[PDB]
Amino acid sequence: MLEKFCNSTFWNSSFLDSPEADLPLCFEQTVLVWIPLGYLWLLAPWQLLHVYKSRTKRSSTTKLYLAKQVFVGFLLILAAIELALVLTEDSGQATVPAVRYTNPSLYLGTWLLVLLIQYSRQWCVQKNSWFLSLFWILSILCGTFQFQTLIRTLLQGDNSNLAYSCLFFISYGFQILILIFSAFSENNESSNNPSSIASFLSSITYSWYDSIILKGYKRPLTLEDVWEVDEEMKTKTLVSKFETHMKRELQKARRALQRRPKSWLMKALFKTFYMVLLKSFLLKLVNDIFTFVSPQLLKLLISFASDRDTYLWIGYLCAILLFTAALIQSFCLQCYFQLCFKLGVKVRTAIMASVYKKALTLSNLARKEYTVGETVNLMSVDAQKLMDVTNFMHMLWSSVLQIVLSIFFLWRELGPSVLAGVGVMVLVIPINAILSTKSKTIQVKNMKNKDKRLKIMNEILSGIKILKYFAWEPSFRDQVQNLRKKELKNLLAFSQLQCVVIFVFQLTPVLVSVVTFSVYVLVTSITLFNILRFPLSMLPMMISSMLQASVSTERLEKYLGGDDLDTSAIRHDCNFDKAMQFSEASFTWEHDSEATVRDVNLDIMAGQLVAVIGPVGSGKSSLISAMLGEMENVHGHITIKGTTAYVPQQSWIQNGTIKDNILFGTEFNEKRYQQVLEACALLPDLEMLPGGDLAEIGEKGINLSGGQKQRISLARATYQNLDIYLLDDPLSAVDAHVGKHIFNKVLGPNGLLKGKTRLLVTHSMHFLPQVDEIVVLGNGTIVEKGSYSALLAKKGEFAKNLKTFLLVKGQKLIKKEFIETGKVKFSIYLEYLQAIGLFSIFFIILAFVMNSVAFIGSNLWLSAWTSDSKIASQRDMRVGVYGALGLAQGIFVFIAHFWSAFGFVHASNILHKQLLNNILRAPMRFFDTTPTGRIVNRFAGDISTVDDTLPQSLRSWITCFLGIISTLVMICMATPVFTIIVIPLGIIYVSVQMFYVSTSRQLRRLDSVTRSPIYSHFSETVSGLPVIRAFEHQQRFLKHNEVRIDTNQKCVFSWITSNRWLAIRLELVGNLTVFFSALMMVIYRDTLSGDTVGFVLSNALNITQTLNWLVRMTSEIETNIVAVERITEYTKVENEAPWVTDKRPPPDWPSKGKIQFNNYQVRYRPELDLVLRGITCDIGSMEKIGVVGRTGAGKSSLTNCLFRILEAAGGQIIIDGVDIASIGLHDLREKLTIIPQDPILFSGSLRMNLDPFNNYSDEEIWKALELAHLKSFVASLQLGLSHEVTEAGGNLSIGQRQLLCLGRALLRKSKILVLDQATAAVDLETDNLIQTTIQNEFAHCTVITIAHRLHTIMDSDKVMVLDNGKIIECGSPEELLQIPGPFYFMAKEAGIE
């Protein structure tokens, strides 16, 4: 009874039938005033409860909030006085309408709830939310109509409720004012990111990002200028949530394998993030619905102009509806896209952090498979592939929806003829199936080859000094080139298959459209067909994305399910009688191989210093590692009471100052720091360093000697002040004086650690009498355990062994990475295109043009065939000639794509070859100054970007440009002056492009400079896992990674937002221009010719869309070319001396050994000082000489300068009358042999490590191995010589590694040989045997020995001593011992005389 209540008519058809239309007022006084109010009411309580949940604190009284409350209150007072006037009018003995009395009460109750909502919000972080703004917008849109009819009525006649009309006008004015005041948002004393504090109208258009883009345009950006991320998007929250879900899923899925890591990391990811997958799904449906509604509005508008007897308001209503629909669709799409992209960033960050966290606790048997380079791949290429699958996920289902709905409209117009089209769709299926199943395995092969290449590259970058000392560059260059060739061969086939898929996808719709009407027997269309082809053109991108993502997900899931390390063997009982107990323990390094340590049982009380001695390969370090628990238990248990401290045999040094390394995360003191430095005799050397204590060290202690590194490690261990100390040979690199001082001042009967228990493993019998108990290990088991005197009395093996024995100047090292500032130089473009090949470009451009001309000719043929040719064989031919054009355009887009694939690969090949070749020829300063993180980043991320992203962008751009050229040519076919409307549009589109490019490019560069500190930190942690796990400093080594990941996330999020800002601008501009063009033709409704206004609209839409796409394609191209620009920098680095020069020495150049220095001077860097000065000496023919000096004197530098690693700063060195500075580097480094101080071994097999040239047979290798005392161990191995060695030679002990190095140097049989501490970790027996071997083998040679053990140096023709780079004494050892000097005192300290 609506009519009875309002005393009016529900709806009159003739009311709007007149040219002037006016809907009934009571309809508006009801439905229009119900929608807005109800929305506010039935939504209010839920938001009230939400505000109640998040009630934390009250903000200050913002002037804006007070003003808005005052305005609402005055509106409420206006409603109240209107109600009072209504009551007064009704009091005059009359019957007022029900609506006139109910309305004011409804308005009063509404304003009251608004006041509460506006107030309650004061307690929330966002003062203006979507609720009120949407309510205001709905109220304005509803009240527009009422105002229209009311004012019309007033114009017709003033005899009405003028007071009512006036109060309604002032009320509508309040509503407009309130909305205006709402979009404003105060700084709310909030200096954080303005993302949180943002009005809804200012948050749907990204108006809060204008400041960053303005400052980027004014001046180049800076890392400090990017606002920090939101609280939720930090690393810790995602890490915790994903860790919980992944652990639950892994625990659930591990039980299945028991019935037999099967299938997970897809359920866990879905379960962790399933809110974000719902909002995007909801938005996609709305976007699609608006996408299908808009064409109907356009068709109705174009049909309006067909008849000239229509009304006036139809066109304006259609234009307004079109504008509103386009705006809403744009806003929904942008939001949907941003949601998809952000979840992509969240999942990437979670994966990276989880991978790093898992890397800390992997078992040895599982860590032997994944090295540093392989894992660095998983946290770069694989994780990035997962970032790219989120954008094309919902479009899978969305495509099927749009296809089905569009097909329905065809059936409406035509009949079952369109239906038959599904048959072709059925065929499209198996073809994709066969092509995809065939292309999946190629990605796996490519991933494996990339893993191998990076594994080789990392070790190459780590071992640069030995490569140069040995001149092994070309072999490794060829080794890398072969793998690159294999990888490119694999990638080519994948590119071809992608081209075939694209061809099929592009060809199918044309034949479908042809066969739609092919069946003549049977019985805007093309517009929808074209629309329908849009969701059926980008599917190949979807297919590639999910294939790559599936392979990545498989390889990560395999990695993350690795075995842990068992710890239920080392019981930490604080309540223990002593401090160490072994109940017949037996541990093994491998899973189930032979037990390295067998049947060990011993116990040592607290405060006892015991020494562990034995032969090479006995198993001492294995025992200490078992104590740490790095081996797999087999039988027994070990009880440990207290903490532990570790001093590894291979010293590990971090990056930073010496003070930071010594502290190792501890409160700085003064009464203990000084004591530690002085006791470890690290004081004199520290004084000589350029920066003193605050001197930068480097990545692996490159800027240090061996003794300095060992003493730094010992000082750190003694400063940390733990309970149990496990020293593994800490007095090997130092000489007699320093060793005696350290033993008498740090660890011994009277030292710093006089109370803590000490367990030291040693090879020298000098400090044995001052110990408490000694143990002699043999074959992994204890042979004899007793005190010094007892063992000597036993007359056992101990007696036999003893009888045989008797910023200021140079603090800043690493320079900050230089970031190009400004535009990208055209030289980069010229270089890249030149690599692809100029001729190849010509063939493609010509082919794509043929596609366009055919497209144009095909469209012209459509135009001719339409209109019935101005009113059946001719018709049959006209219908028939469509597959010619379709097949033509398909084969043209095939040749273009196919031809491009061959080119891009050839370019990626040339670029990588040039980069590798140039990097391999840099000096040592560049290698020691920059960490390996930057080089690895350039070798992996940029190469992957060049391989993958650039082609697609470049192919896409050429399509768009030719598209406009074609569209422009078609438009200019007629209406010649129409070309003018393009110029203002061109300027408008160019302007936004020349304002967003500056910020987009600089954000890209900043991202690729903040990505390396993540790789640079993952390499120094893996190398020092035992120290970290022994010192229990694990929780500290994760906050650094979290910070380093958050820094990169900060740049990535800001980049994605900038893309959205540009789109919402370009789409708005296109909407506005399209709407403006449509209205003008509406005004000219009487001057139209043959309704030509029909197509003038269709053309405008296509033009704007292509223009918008191009302005988006060009920006991407620039940001991706930045990657090639960053690659190019490492191609023009300073080079060393020429490898081979015109000056060529004759064969057998070194017929004798007559090295003769002459006042040699050398400095390591041009900024540092001189390390060698006044060196004048002579080496006689085939003379055995020995050089001995205190640590830091420079002996290693002296023997290093013979290989031209450092250019001479004055003076010259001659070898048989031929100055060294006049020959090629490979003309000298080739003829000499040297065994470096630090033994470094490559990966692969033992044979490859012995000679990576295949120039020797097996028999000579066996003989050389016998000569180096390695026959027993090698023969006892399962595989004779094909045994694999882990990276950095972790599969062998130090003694075996040194013996292997000696055996390797024993093969080249050169003329000049130099020893550099070849017996550092070798027992005296083996030392004597190898000394006899060297004496009997290198008789016809010149040998230089650098050994701190004077036993070997005793027999030599000349003995040289060094102190600070200056030779002090020189002469025969007998003369030096006879005359009281430094050598006599050194020998007396050694106790040999």
Ligand X SMILES: Nc1ncnc2c1ncn2[C@@H]1O[C@H](COP(=O)(O)OP(=O)(O)OP(=O)(O)O)[C@@H](O)[C@H]1O
Segment contacting Mg ion by CB under 5 A, of 65-73, 684-692, 939-947, 1194-1202:
1194-1202
The one among 417, 622, 1196, 1200 contacting Mg ion by CB under 5 A: 1196
Which partner in ligand CLR, ligand X, Mg ion, none is near 702 (CB below 5 to 8 A by kind)? ligand X
Give the separation between CA 309 and CA 369, rounded to whole angstroms: 82
Question: What's the closest the beta carbon of residue 1344 comes to Mg ion, in angstroms?
Answer: 13
- Binding residues for ligand CLR, rule: CB under 6 A, are 20-21, 141, 144-145, 147-148, 151-152, 155, 312-313, 316-317, 320, 829, 841, 844, 900, 954-955, 957-958, 991-992, 995, 1065, 1068-1069, 1114, 1117-1118
If the CB atoms of residues 707 and 1024 are measured against ligand X, the closer one turns out to be 707
The neighbour count for residue 592, using CB atoms within 10 Å, is: 9
If the CB atoms of residues 363 and 525 are measured against ligand X, the closer one turns out to be 363
Segment contacting ligand X by CB under 6 A, of 396-404, 1179-1187, 1190-1198, 1203-1211:
1190-1198
Q: Residue 643 has what DSSP assignment? A: -
Q: Residue 228 has what DSSP assignment? A: P
The interface mask with ligand X, positions 1199-1218, x = CB under 6 A, is --------------------
Phi first, then psi, for residue 638 (nearest 5°) are -130, 125
Q: Quickly list DSSP for 1329-1369.
A: HHHHHHHHHSTTSEEEEE-S-HHHHTS-SEEEEESSSSEEE
Question: What's the closest the beta carbon of residue 598 comes to ligand X, in angstroms?
Answer: 12
Report the candidate in 645, 801, 787 with the shortest Cα–Cα distance to residue 728.
645
Residues 562-621 touching ligand X, rule: CB under 6 A, are 589, 596, 616-621
Q: 615 among the known binding-site residues?
A: yes
Interruption sites in the chain after residues (C→N beyond 2.5 Å): 260, 523, 806, 871
Q: 1192 among the known binding-site residues?
A: yes
Question: Which segments of 184-206 does DSSP mark as H helices, in order?
Answer: 200-203
Give the separation between CA 851 and CA 846, rounded to whole angstroms: 9
Which partner in ligand X, ligand CLR, Mg ion, none is near 954 (CB below 5 to 8 A by kind)? ligand CLR
Q: Total binding residues for Mg ion by CB under 5 A? A: 4
Q: Is the dihedral of CA 701, 704, 710, 712 positive or negative?
A: negative
Q: 1194 among the known binding-site residues?
A: yes
Q: Which tokens hold the place of 262?
A: 């099967």
Question: What's the closest the beta carbon of residue 1118 comes to ligand CLR, in angstroms?
Answer: 6
If the CB atoms of residues 217 and 472 are measured against ligand CLR, the closer one turns out to be 217
If the CB atoms of residues 162 and 223 are measured against ligand CLR, the closer one turns out to be 162
Residues 899-938 touching ligand X, rule: CB under 6 A, are 928
Give the separation between CA 1322 and CA 561, rounded to whole angstroms: 40
The interface mask with ligand X, positions 641-660, x = CB under 6 A, is --------x-----------
Q: Which residue's C-beta sits nearest to Mg ion?
A: 1196
Phi first, then psi, for residue 1156 (nearest 5°) are -145, 110
Residues 1020-1039 touching Mg ion, rule: CB under 5 A, are none
Give the separation between CA 598 and CA 633, rounded to whole angstroms: 11
Q: 956 among the known binding-site residues?
A: no
Residues 724-763 touching ligand X, rule: CB under 6 A, are 733
Q: Which tokens hold the place of 622?
A: 């294995």
Which partner in Mg ion, ligand CLR, ligand X, none is near 957 (CB below 5 to 8 A by kind)? ligand CLR
Q: 880 among the known binding-site residues?
A: no
Give the separation between CA 70 and CA 1367, rounded to whole angstroms: 93
Question: What's the closest the beta carbon of residue 1293 comes to ligand X, in angstroms?
Answer: 3
Q: What is the rounded end-to-end Cα distance, in angstroms, of the chain? A: 126
Q: 1128 among the known binding-site residues?
A: no
Q: Total binding residues for ligand X by CB under 6 A? A: 37
Question: What's the closest the beta carbon of residue 519 comes to ligand CLR, in angstroms?
Answer: 40
Which partner in Mg ion, ligand CLR, ligand X, none is near 596 (CB below 5 to 8 A by kind)? ligand X
Give the type of residue at 1255. N
If the CB atoms of residues 637 and 1085 are measured against ligand CLR, the closer one turns out to be 1085
Question: What's the closest the beta carbon of residue 1317 comes to Mg ion, in angstroms?
Answer: 6
Question: What's the closest the beta carbon of residue 935 comes to ligand X, in angstroms?
Answer: 18
If the CB atoms of residues 216 and 619 are measured against ligand CLR, the closer one turns out to be 216
Report the candidate in 977, 1050, 1059, 969 with the shortest Cα–Cα distance to residue 1009.
1050
The neighbour count for residue 593, using CB atoms within 10 Å, is: 11
Question: What's the closest the beta carbon of residue 796 comes to ligand X, in angstroms?
Answer: 19
Q: Which residues contact 451 (CB under 8 A, 6 or more apart)?
A: 373, 374, 377
Coil, strand or helix: which one is 921? Answer: coil
Question: What's the closest the beta carbon of residue 775 comes to Mg ion, in angstroms?
Answer: 15
Phi first, then psi, for residue 549 (nearest 5°) are -65, -35
938 within 8 A of 1015, measured Cβ to Cβ:
no
Coil, strand or helix: which one is 72? Answer: helix
Q: 691 among the known binding-site residues?
A: no
Q: 614 among the known binding-site residues?
A: yes
353 within 8 A of 378, measured Cβ to Cβ:
no
Question: What's the closest the beta carbon of residue 558 comes to ligand X, in angstroms?
Answer: 23
If one asks whether residue 649 binds Mg ion (CB under 5 A), the answer comes out as yes
If the CB atoms of residues 1171 and 1306 are measured against ligand X, the closer one turns out to be 1171
Q: Which tokens hold the place of 13?
A: 């058809």
Q: Quickly list DSSP for 560-619.
A: HT------TTEEE-SS-SSSEEESSEEEESSSSS--SEEEE--B--TT-EEEEE--TTSS
Give the type of residue at 1265. L
The one among 399, 1197, 1212, 1331 contacting ligand X by CB under 6 A: 1197
If the CB atoms of residues 148 and 190 are measured against ligand CLR, the closer one turns out to be 148
If one asks whether residue 811 binds ligand X (CB under 6 A), the answer comes out as no
Distance of CA 91 to the CA centre of its chain: 78
Q: 215 among the known binding-site residues?
A: no
Which partner in ligand CLR, Mg ion, ligand X, none is near 20 (CB below 5 to 8 A by kind)? ligand CLR
If one asks whether residue 621 binds Mg ion (CB under 5 A), the answer comes out as yes
Give the separation between CA 1186 and CA 1108, rounded to whole angstroms: 77
Question: What's the closest the beta carbon of residue 830 comes to ligand CLR, in angstroms?
Answer: 9
Question: What's the closest the beta carbon of residue 1026 comes to Mg ion, in angstroms?
Answer: 12
Give the separation between CA 1038 and CA 1025, rounded to whole angstroms: 13
Question: What's the closest the beta carbon of residue 595 comes to ligand X, in angstroms?
Answer: 10
- Which strands make up the sheet holding 1172-1175, listed edge to edge? 1172-1175, 1156-1162, 1210-1214
1277 within 8 A of 593, measured Cβ to Cβ:
no
If the CB atoms of residues 889 and 1196 are measured against Mg ion, the closer one turns out to be 1196
Give the separation between CA 923 and CA 460, rounded to whole angstroms: 15
The residues with which 640 forms a beta bridge, in sequence order, are 572, 580
If one asks whether residue 1237 binds Mg ion (CB under 5 A), the answer comes out as yes
Q: 963 among the known binding-site residues?
A: no
Coil, strand or helix: which one is 39? Answer: helix
Segment contacting ligand X by CB under 6 A, of 704-712, 1033-1041, 1155-1163, 1204-1212:
704-712
If one asks whether residue 1294 binds ligand X (CB under 6 A), the answer comes out as yes
Q: Quickly list DSSP for 1279-1305.
A: SSS--B--GGGTTS-HHHHHHHHHHHH
Report the candidate in 144, 147, 174 with the shortest Cα–Cα distance to residue 79.
174
Segment contacting ligand X by CB under 6 A, of 490-498, 1006-1014, 1149-1157, 1293-1301:
1293-1301
Question: Which segments of 195-266 does DSSP mark as H helices, in order?
Answer: 200-203, 210-218, 235-259
Site residues (vs ligand X, CB under 6 A): 589, 596, 616-622, 649, 689, 702-703, 705-708, 733, 928, 1164, 1171, 1191-1197, 1237, 1290-1296, 1321
Known binding positions: 614-621, 1189-1196
Site residues (vs Mg ion, CB under 5 A): 621, 649, 1196, 1237
Known binding positions for ATP: 614-621, 1189-1196
